[PDB]
């Protein structure tokens, strides 16, 4: 829905690295390299960023009820 605060498996904080990851993809880096630059070395942390799906951008398009 929105990027999780912590890696489920080990607990390292990953909720502050989502913006940095999208910017690196505009500069043409490959996904593996982008994760490497952010120092996410264990593959438990890597799944969190690599496989998250950002649905909150879709839900905001619905005009506020109030």
Partner 1 sequence: GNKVHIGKVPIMLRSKFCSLRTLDEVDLYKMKECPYDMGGYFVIN
Partner 2 sequence: GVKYTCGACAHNFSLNKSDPVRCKECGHRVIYKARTKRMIQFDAR
Supply the minimum distance, in Å, between the C-beta of residue 3 and partner 1: 22
Torsion of CA 30, 33, 39, 41, to 10 degrees: 100
Question: Residue 7's binding partner, choosing from partner 1, partner 2, Zn ion, none, with beta-carbon cut-off 5 to 8 A by kind?
Answer: Zn ion
Residues that bind Zn ion (CB under 5 A): 7, 10, 44-45
Task: Give the distance from CA 44 to its chain's centroid.
Answer: 13
Give the span between the Cα atoms of 4 and 13, in whole angstroms: 9
Known binding residues for Zn(2+) are 7, 10, 44-45
Q: Which residues bind partner 2 (CB under 8 A)?
A: 64-66
């Amino acid at each position: 829905m929105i990027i999780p605060v912590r890696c489920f498996s080990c607990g390292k904080v990953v909720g502050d690295k989502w913006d940095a990851y999208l910017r690196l993809l505009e500069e043409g880096k490959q996904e593996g390299d982008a994760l490497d630059e952010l120092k996410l070395k264990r593959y438990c942390c890597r799944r969190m960023v690599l496989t998250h799906v950002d649905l909150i951008e879709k839900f905001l398009r619905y005009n506020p009820l109030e």
